[PDB]
Design a protein around this ligand. Sequence first.
Ligand SMILES: Cc1cc2nc3c(=O)[nH]c(=O)nc-3n(C[C@H](O)[C@H](O)[C@H](O)COP(=O)(O)OP(=O)(O)OC[C@H]3O[C@@H](n4cnc5c(N)ncnc54)[C@H](O)[C@@H]3O)c2cc1C
Length: 369
Amino acid sequence: KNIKILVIGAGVAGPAVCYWLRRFGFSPVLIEKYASIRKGGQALDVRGIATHIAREMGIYDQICEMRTRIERGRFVDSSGKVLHEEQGDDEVEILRGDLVEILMKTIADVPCYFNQSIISIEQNADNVTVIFMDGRIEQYDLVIAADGIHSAIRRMIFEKNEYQLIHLGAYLSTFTIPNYLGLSHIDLECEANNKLVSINSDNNPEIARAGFMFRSQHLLNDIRDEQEQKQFLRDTFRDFGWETQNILNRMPESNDFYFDAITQVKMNSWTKGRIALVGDAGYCPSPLSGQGNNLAFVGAYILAGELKVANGNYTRAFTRYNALLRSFVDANQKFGVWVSESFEERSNKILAMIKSISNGITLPQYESS
Ligand SMILES: Cc1cc2nc3c(=O)[nH]c(=O)nc-3n(C[C@H](O)[C@H](O)[C@H](O)COP(=O)(O)OP(=O)(O)OC[C@H]3O[C@@H](n4cnc5c(N)ncnc54)[C@H](O)[C@@H]3O)c2cc1C
């Protein structure tokens, strides 16, 4: 309760760790770079032991409310003809925006500052110094980075040899546009030239959430520039046909637009000194893994937990934090790489794989003494 803690960014894991920290007696603070939380995103499956975690946060019922209601989908060709349609445990498929908002609804007690960015971070035995972009300066006992795959807190506190970012050779994009098709609870996707386009409707009938997935070795100079992301999207899907151009034209007005390149972070240690990485920052499995959503839950839970049992000793708390998840992250990260290799109903062999990897770790209770 005494120690001053800082959580950076509102993700899944970012808000998740805050709630577990607050519930365990701590009083942390959450800061965010964007003016408000970013709700935009695709549907994500909460599964494995993460479903257990969702319940004890009391948000499981809210998740089942916002779960994907989409009834059907069919795989279109370039011309619109239908090649294939709709064919082929406690877990839920829910838009991360709903999940994030549900997570943000839980931590509402916890202070959250948006429009806050860290231009500098320093560390010694006594404290952790932070320099905000607005010029404000503060020192915390511990700092947890929710930044994710591209985390700046990782590059600042770590050198090049300590961690490595692995590129799985594919990109991903999604965003919300008004529905020109007018379809409701339907999903249309066409796979051509190792590229995929996905446009669908959901509980909100007005808007259709589009998406783009293509396998490429191309490297943007700066991956944080949206227009380079957007321009790169057009260049790749130029000549693709079908509904491509009609989607790209309604793109510019989408506020939730998200672009990135599938990658997974490999690090020996997820914590250095008084600073620790959570979520995609340290262990990110990447989108193709599909379990990237869950690692935030398992990580934010064990992180906050190990710090409480530490009784003030953070070094040991972080060492037990690293040791436990590496077994889980390893088996998990390798799944995302395996699916990254690929791209009948015998193919259900992969479904059995996920159920094995998702449940593959044992959570210390931390609740029951
Ligand atoms: C908007 C968005 C959309 C996504 N869509 C998909 C998807 O469609 N499919 C998929 O497989 N995965 C997607 N992901 C990745 C996936 O959701 C995460 O890997 C997973 O949920 C774990 O989240 P996290 O804890 O790493 O936080 P993340 O989801 O990585 O979010 C990090 C948050 O921290 C904030 N932040 C980042 N950098 C800084 C900084 N320097 N200073 C302050 N704040 C910062 C950002 O506002 C961001 O909301 C998305 C992530 C985001 C942020």
